Paper text:
Phosphoprotein phosphatase‐1 (PP1) is a key player in the regulation of phospho‐serine (pSer) and phospho‐threonine (pThr) dephosphorylation and is involved in a large fraction of cellular signaling pathways. A tight regulation is therefore essential, and in vivo the enzymatic activity of PP1 is restrained and specified by the formation of holoenzymes. Besides this layer for control of enzymatic activity, acute activity control of PP1 is also provided by post‐translational modifications (PTMs), especially by phosphorylation of a conserved threonine residue (numbering 320 in PP1α, 316 in PP1β and 311 in PP1γ) in the proline‐rich PxTPP sequence of the disordered C‐terminal tail (C‐tail). The phosphorylation of this Thr by cyclin‐dependent kinases (CDKs) represents an important control mechanism for cell‐cycle progression and neuronal differentiation, and it has been associated in vivo with an inhibitory effect on PP1.
For the phosphorylated C‐tail, it is possible that the negative charges of pThr320 promote the formation of new interactions with another region of PP1α, thus inducing a closed, inactive protein conformation. To test this hypothesis, the T320E variant of the most abundant isoform PP1α was expressed, purified and crystallized following a previously reported protocol. The structure was solved at 1.9 Å to determine whether the insertion of a negative charge in the tail induces a conformational change or leads to its stabilization by binding to the catalytic protein core. Similar to previous structures, no electron density was observed for amino acids following P298 in PP1α containing Glu in position 320. We did not observe a significant change in the kinetic parameters between wild‐type and T320E enzyme in either of the two assays. This shows that the introduction of a negative charge to mimic the phosphorylation of Thr320 does not measurably affect the enzymatic activity in vitro. However, the introduction of phosphate‐mimicking PP1 mutations did not appear to induce such an inactivating conformational change, as the phosphatase activity of these PP1 variants was not destroyed by trypsinolysis. This conclusion is consistent with the crystal structure of PP1α‐T320E obtained, which did not reveal structural rearrangements. According to our findings, the phosphorylation of Thr320 is also not likely to lead to a folding of the C‐terminal tail and its binding to the PP1 catalytic core.
Residue numbers in the entry: 8 to 298
The structure:
């Protein structure tokens, strides 16, 4: 009953933020199981074509997810690539992931979700998604989401020129074949290629690879980016994973962009959200959502 699920998720459009949508347990379990098989049938390194809308972190800010679709166009009017970190911190992670999974099932060739570092049980145990599942449903449903997260794809290349992933580059990343050989389902390890793709950050003050203040993975400098793009015949890295005041922010003379789609992020920041449009000529533009 996929249309009924989407209809009830969208009903709270225009409402005051916070109003819950409580689907049944069996509906939610259905969403995980069907989306999981779609994720596994599709490559772990997606090959996408413009036109596309690209969105960064959401973190359970469900009313801002609805805002994004209002600006970008509700599926299937636009094609979407999300870069991860759907859950934790916000008050409505369940509504957020459920609508994203519902859209992946309904439009499986035009709607895409990458894995962020919060799509990992050990992380979202700490940062709120476990608690939200336990309170509103039960722990077994959280384990069902985990099994589904473990199958998400990790990266995307749009029209052979834009490399997308949640976190960033890896010192272990020599060829795109290494990403394609990552076996799913898997948990995110504490180090290595999959970790770095989900966890690394650019840094304006590092030359080469540096220690990451997060305590996980690395920072990389502008020269790492330029070498990567030249080596792989790419034009742009598109990533998320860090809040930026204007919703998007360029790095390395516009060779990398950070996208963040949760305005007024977890109430603490006064940032805009942004969504990047890529048209058929690979021109990029940004739609801005102020707090
Ligand atoms: Mn995040
Ligand atoms: Mn992140």
């Amino acid at each position: 009953n996929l249309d009924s699920i989407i209809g009830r998720l969208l009903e709270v459009q225009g409402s005051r933020p916070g109003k819950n949508v409580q689907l049944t347990e069996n509906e939610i379990r259905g969403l995980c199981l069907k989306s999981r098989e779609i994720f596994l049938s599709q490559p772990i390194l997606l090959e996408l074509e413009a036109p596309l809308k690209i969105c960064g972190d959401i973190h359970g800010q469900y009313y801002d997810l609805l805002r994004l679709f209002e600006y970008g166009g509700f599926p299937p009017e636009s094609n979407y690539l999300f870069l991860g970190d759907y859950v934790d911190r916000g008050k409505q992670s369940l509504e957020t992931i459920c609508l994203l999974l519902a859209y992946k099932i309904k439009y499986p060739e035009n709607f895409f979700l990458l894995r962020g570092n919060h799509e990992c049980a050990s992380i979202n145990r700490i940062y709120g998604f476990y608690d939200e599942c336990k309170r509103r449903y039960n722990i077994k449903l959280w384990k069902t989401f985990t099994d589904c997260f473990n199958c998400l794809p990790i990266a995307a290349i749009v029209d052979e020129k834009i490399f997308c992933c949640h976190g960033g580059l890896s010192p272990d990343l020599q060829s795109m074949e290494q990403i394609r050989r990552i076996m799913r389902p898997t948990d995110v390890p504490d180090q290595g290629l999959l970790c770095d793709l989900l966890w690394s950050d650019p840094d304006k003050d590092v030359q080469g690879w540096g220690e990451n203040d997060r305590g996980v993975s690395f920072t990389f400098g502008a020269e790492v980016v330029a070498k990567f793009l030249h080596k792989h015949d790419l034009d742009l890295i598109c990533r998320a994973h860090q809040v930026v005041e204007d919703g998007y922010e360029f790095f390395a003379k516009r060779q990398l962009v950070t996208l963040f789609s949760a305005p007024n992020y977890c109430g603490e920041f006064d940032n805009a959200g942004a969504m990047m449009s890529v048209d058929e000529t690979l021109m990029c533009s940004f739609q801005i959502l102020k707090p």
